[PDB]
């Protein structure tokens, strides 16, 4: 019968910091992590900036010998996972290792690695492909490598649901525990899609902000002058735990995961419907899953990608789900500061939603100078808003019309 | 408690055929789908063969224009999904579309599209990259496109657990239905990594059979002369359905999905442990999930990849789980005929396990001329074996030591 699930550990690499507290400090201070990209030449690209992870040292986590075999998205995923597990205080034993699993996902996975091996194949031939090309690039190897290093013998898998990956990964890991398949799950996602194919590929679709001359002002969710999303890199990981197992070991509990919804738009490969019908269905599934009156919702960490269509669809979804209470809750997009971490989006934003509950503060939407037509809710423009938050909701929407919603509340 | 889940439709592209009955007819005849790969200069590669899909006509499913936008792995996934839905006789309506979802996954995803867009990028720069590059290459687009084409608004997601993808997709889809999150799911996996990067990538790890002189003999699970797996392409899809929903509309039910087990080896990135301790825990987990005693298992569709360490671990795992019943059950590897479809392996092998129940026949392990040390189980060498089959297991054990087991039972 269905068990309760709490958050006892979190971990992160973001464009604002190499852990949670440094990332969170940046969020509350309204700081942008967006900057011209330095790790490659982008003069031929329409977009030349993004949220890079700055000064990441993999040797805080892994031997240079193992690190060399792994795409950055895996290094980022393991870093966030290791932080989350350490932060949880949990010790892995023969008694519990079969009951601890991992679900760390990615939207695109090892694109840099596949690109670099593609260049070796084309310039030199197949004999120059790394022997580590497959284990070092494919999306499930965050879950795999993490299980090997820590001895996790529980459910071991990975989701790939584009920009919804992190939310789905956390949601379904919670279901694992809820239904007794595991007592502990490390869940979230990682992304590093800032290579030629990534920036080029989103470039070709005309999906990215081209504001190359003012990168910190590019990501401006619901601003009338927004021109697409800002591509960003990193990882979020949470330790999810059965409540009684957490109480049994005297775990510090950040919050309770009370609600998970999924829906498909069944509308368009890449465009959300203007009315946010699928987002609405998703949030309603989540609230019913949590047993909540929608008026209990205090804070929404929006998907809020800074696209023309996605942003307005979210307002429509929120107004349709919350009616008049849509004017009382606070909604913000931390993507205003971090940019869009794609598959890791839902993972870092679930962490911000939990830290919103711990600290009783709504993070800001920076750059919201001129709210667009119909965008007339509390969008926490410019500056963090201290306020009562009992219930926090985190939304993700992806290519394929794939929707995810997480519902967190304060735990006593 | 928990709802019962049945199989009401199946769909497939394999190296043996362009649908289930043609594929199955090959399986029961012991036919190989393995041949040298065409329209591709493999001169500089140590492997020049695999299981290609032969004669696939995407325009039976899609317009030329929509097919141009999608990697072959996505096309293959949609073919199987379309077959399975049609095979089910399901009618999607406004009254049920929110209760119908998709979980079609892949191990490796759009290598062929990545290869071709790399060519453009390296030759001509980023502005030649296709607008559809990203949505046409990411693993969740089978679920995405299928949900858009059929108006499916239920849970929409995708697994990527390497060679365990298909087994995990079907298992977690069954959970969605059992715990009332959906009445219907389309689940399985697809793969097309017979490109330079797949053959090169796996070739660089020396994972592949290099028996170029005799492609049909390359795949020889548990034979003392096996020298690694054979890379194969295709897709499996199953329509999973809650039992009462199936009975009400008068569906033809192939079999019941009674059990799903997962585990992690926590051993090595690509090598199983010698004793198959992980595959043993996963099978025990699947049998416990099904409330069945190991003694009740009649037929196992092995992982049976034709790798030295993989085959021997599966024998040890079975002997350990099954004790004095281990010789009584029949266990075959259809990979002896199909080769290894990676993330689609588990989907097509689930279908073969369901058809072994319908037809009371264990498919052969072809090329098993000289069983290896300790491979003294009933491995159904050379030819099909008619027998009693009430309960059938399908095992998948992939990179990162991620294990999956499905338990199917005859339905009357
Ligand atoms: C070729 N074989 N099966 C099919 C389709 N079934 C349903 C939609 S298209 N085309």
| SS3 assignment for chain A | CCCCEEEEEEEEEECCECCHHHHHHHHHCCCCCCEECCCCCCCCCCCCEEECCCCCCHHHCCCHHHHCCCCHHHHHHHHHHHHHHHHHCCCCCCCCHHHEEEEEECCCCCHHHHHHHHHHHHHCCHHHCCCCCCCCCCCCHHHHHHHHHHCCCCCEECECCHHHHHHHHHHHHHHHHHCCCCCEEEEEEEECCCCHHHHHHHHHHCCECCCCCCHHHCCCCCECCCCCECEECEEEEEEEEEHHHHHHCCCCCCEEEEEEEEEECCCCCCCCCCCCHHHHHHHHHHHHHHCCCHHHEEEEECCCCCCHHHHHHHHHHHHHHHHHHHHCCEEECCHHHHCECHHHHHHHHHHHHHHHHHHCEECCECCCCCECCCCCCCCCECCCEECCCCEEEEEEEECCCEEEEEEEECCC
Burial B114-142 (b: 16+ CB within 10 A, else e): bbbbbebbeeeebeebbbbbbbbbbbbbb
Burial A175-203 (b: 16+ CB within 10 A, else e): bbbbeebbbbbbbbbbbbbbbbbbbbbbb
State the best of A143, A144, A145, A272 to mutate against chain B, taking most chain B CBs within 10 Å: A144
In a 3-state reduction of DSSP, which class is residue B61?
coil
Task: Identify whether the C-beta of residue B198 lies closer than 8 Å to the C-beta of residue B111.
Answer: yes
Task: Identify whether the C-beta of residue B103 lies closer than 8 Å to the C-beta of residue B80.
Answer: no
Task: Identify whether the C-beta of residue A6 lies closer than 8 Å to the C-beta of residue A241.
Answer: yes
Element (H, E) at B397: strand B391-398
In a 3-state reduction of DSSP, which class is residue B394?
strand
How far is Cα A231 from Cα A219, in angstroms, rounded to an integer? 10
* Spatial strand order in the sheet of A391-398: A156-157, A100-105, A184-191, A234-242, A5-13, A255-264, A402-409, A391-398, A297-301, A330-332
How far is Cα B74 from Cα A385, in angstroms, rounded to an integer? 45
> Is beta strand B49-51 parallel, antiparallel or unpaired with respect to B34-36?
antiparallel
- Token code pair at residue A187: 């869940």
Experimental method: X-ray
Task: Identify whether the C-beta of residue A33 lies closer than 8 Å to the C-beta of residue A26.
Answer: yes
Question: How many residues comprise chain A?
Answer: 412
Q: How far is CA A403 from the centre of its chain?
A: 13
With CB atoms and an 8 Å threshold, state whether A133 touches B160.
Answer: no
Among the partner residues A117, A121, A153, nearest to B263 by beta-carbon distance: A153
Residue B307 makes CB contacts below 8 A (sequence gap 6+) with B207, B226, B228, B229
Tell me how far CA of residue A346 lies from CA of A187, A209, B160, B172, B402, in angstroms: 11, 20, 18, 21, 24
| CA angle (B156, B162, B167) in 5-degree steps | 60
Task: Calculate helix-pair angle for A196-205, A111-123, nearest 10 degrees.
Answer: 110
Max CA pair span of chain B:
64
Long-range contacts of A242-249 (CB under 8 A, 24+ apart): A242/A3, A242/A4, A242/A5, A242/A177, A242/A183, A242/A184, A243/A3, A243/A4, A243/A5, A243/A6, A244/A3, A245/A183, A245/A184, A246/A6, A246/A8, A249/A89, A249/A90
In a 3-state reduction of DSSP, which class is residue B39?
coil
Sign of dihedral through CA atoms A246, A248, A251, A253? positive
Max CA pair span of chain A:
64
Task: Identify whether the C-beta of residue A239 lies closer than 8 Å to the C-beta of residue A186.
Answer: yes
How far is Cα A166 from Cα A200, in angstroms, rounded to an integer? 23
Among the partner residues B135, B264, B269, nearest to A270 by beta-carbon distance: B135
Atom of ligand 1 minimally distant from the CA of B11: 3
Burial of A253 (0-12, 13-18, 19+ CB in 10 A): middle
State the best of A115, A156, A168 to mutate against chain B, taking most chain B CBs within 10 Å: A156
Q: What does the DSSP assignment read for B215-273?
A: HHHH--TTBTT--SB-BB-EEEEEEEEEHHHHHHTT----EEEEEEEEEE--S-SSPPP
Task: Calculate helix-pair angle for A72-88, A141-150, nearest 10 degrees.
Answer: 40
Cα of B356 vs centre of ligand 1, distance in Å, is 24
Element (H, E) at B5: strand B5-13
User: Who lines ligand 1 at CB under 6 A?
Assistant: B 60-61, 82-83, 86
Burial of B15 (0-12, 13-18, 19+ CB in 10 A): buried
How far is Cα B54 from Cα A11, in angstroms, rounded to an integer? 47
Nearest chain B residue to A161 by CA: give it.
Answer: B140
Beta bridge partners of A137: none
Burial of B175 (0-12, 13-18, 19+ CB in 10 A): buried
- Residue whose C-alpha is closest to residue A100's, from A169, A177, A170: A177
Task: Identify whether the C-beta of residue A327 lies closer than 8 Å to the C-beta of residue A377.
Answer: yes
- Residue whose C-alpha is closest to residue B116's, from B93, B132, B95, B94: B132
Any A CB within 8 A of B328 CB: no
Beta bridge partners of B409: B256, B391
How far is Cα B395 from Cα B280, in angstroms, rounded to an integer? 10
Element (H, E) at B87: helix B72-88
Q: Which of B10, B60, B76 is the best mutation target for the ligand 1 pocket, counting ligand atoms within 8 Å of the beta carbon and taking the most?
A: B60
- Residue whose C-alpha is closest to residue A144's, from A160, A128, A158, A130: A158
List helix spans (H) across B290-344.
308-322, 335-338
Domain segments of chain B as ranges: 6-259, 260-412
CB pairs < 8 Å spanning A and B: 291
How far is Cα A197 from Cα A199, in angstroms, rounded to an integer? 6
Task: Identify whether the C-beta of residue B179 lies closer than 8 Å to the C-beta of residue B186.
Answer: no
Q: Name the one residue in this structure whose structure tokens are 């909604």.
A: A331
With CB atoms and an 8 Å threshold, state whether A201 touches B129.
Answer: yes
Element (H, E) at B331: strand B330-332
Model resolution, angstroms = 2.0
Any B CB within 8 A of A4 CB: no
Task: Identify whether the C-beta of residue A410 lies closer than 8 Å to the C-beta of residue A255.
Answer: yes
Any B CB within 8 A of A66 CB: no
How far is Cα B72 from Cα B381, in angstroms, rounded to an integer? 33
Beta bridge partners of A395: A405
Element (H, E) at B114: helix B111-124
Tell me how far CA of residue B85 lies from CA of A79, B186, B356, B410, in angstroms: 42, 8, 21, 21
Q: Give the CA count within 13 Å in the CB-facing half-sphere of A243.
A: 12
With CB atoms and an 8 Å threshold, state whether B114 touches A114.
Answer: yes
């Amino acid at each position: 019968s269905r068990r309760r699930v709490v958050i006892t550990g979190m971990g992160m690499l973001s464009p604002l910091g190499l852990d949670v507290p440094s990332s969170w400090e940046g969020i509350l201070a309204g700081r942008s992590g967006i900057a011209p990209i330095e790790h490659m030449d982008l003069s031929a690209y329409s977009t030349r900036f993004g949220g890079s992870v700055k000064g990441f040292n993999v040797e805080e986590y892994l031997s240079a010998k193992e690190a060399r075999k792994l795409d950055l998205f895996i290094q980022y995923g393991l870093a966030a996972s290791f932080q989350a597990v350490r932060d949880s205080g949990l010790e892995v034993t023969d008694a519990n290792r079969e009951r601890i699993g991992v679900s760390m996902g990615s939207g695109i996975g090892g694109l840099t690695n596949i690109e670099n091996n593609c260049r070796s194949l084309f310039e030199q031939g197949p004999r120059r492909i790394s022997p580590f090309f497959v284990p070092g690039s494919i999306i499930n190897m965050v879950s795999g490598f993490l299980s090997i290093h820590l001895g996790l013998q529980g459910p071991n898998y990975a989701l790939t649901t584009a920009q919804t990956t992190g939310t789905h990964s956390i949601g379904m890991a919670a279901r694992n525990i809820a239904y007794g398949e595991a007592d502990v799950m490390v869940a979230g996602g990682s992304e590093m899609a800032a290579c030629g194919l990534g920036l080029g590929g989103f470039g070709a679709a005309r999906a990215l902000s081209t504001r190359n001359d003012e990168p910190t002002r590019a990501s401006r969710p619901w601003d009338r002058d927004r021109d697409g999303f800002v591509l960003s890199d990193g990882s979020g990981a949470l330790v999810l735990e059965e409540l009684e197992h957490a109480r049994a070991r005297g775990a510090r509990i950040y919050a309770e995961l009370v609600g998970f919804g999924m829906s498909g738009d069944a509308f368009h490969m890449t465009a959300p419907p203007e009315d946010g019908a699928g987002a609405a269905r998703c949030m309603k599934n989540a609230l019913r899953d949590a047993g909540l009156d929608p008026r209990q919702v205090d804070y929404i960490n929006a998907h809020g990608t800074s696209t023309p269509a996605g942003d307005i669809a979210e307002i429509a979804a929120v107004k349709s789900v919350f009616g008049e209470h849509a004017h009382a809750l606070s909604m913000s997009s931390t993507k205003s500061m971090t940019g869009h971490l794609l598959g890791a989006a839902g993972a870092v934003e679930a962490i911000f939603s939990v830290l919103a509950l711990r600290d009783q503060v709504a993070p800001p939407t920076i750059n919201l100078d001129n709210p667009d037509e119909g965008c007339d809710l509390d969008l926490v423009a410019h500056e963090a808003k201290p306020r009562k938050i009992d219930v926090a909701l985190s939304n993700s929407f992806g290519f394929g019309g794939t929707n995810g919603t997480l519902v967190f509340r304060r735990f006593a």
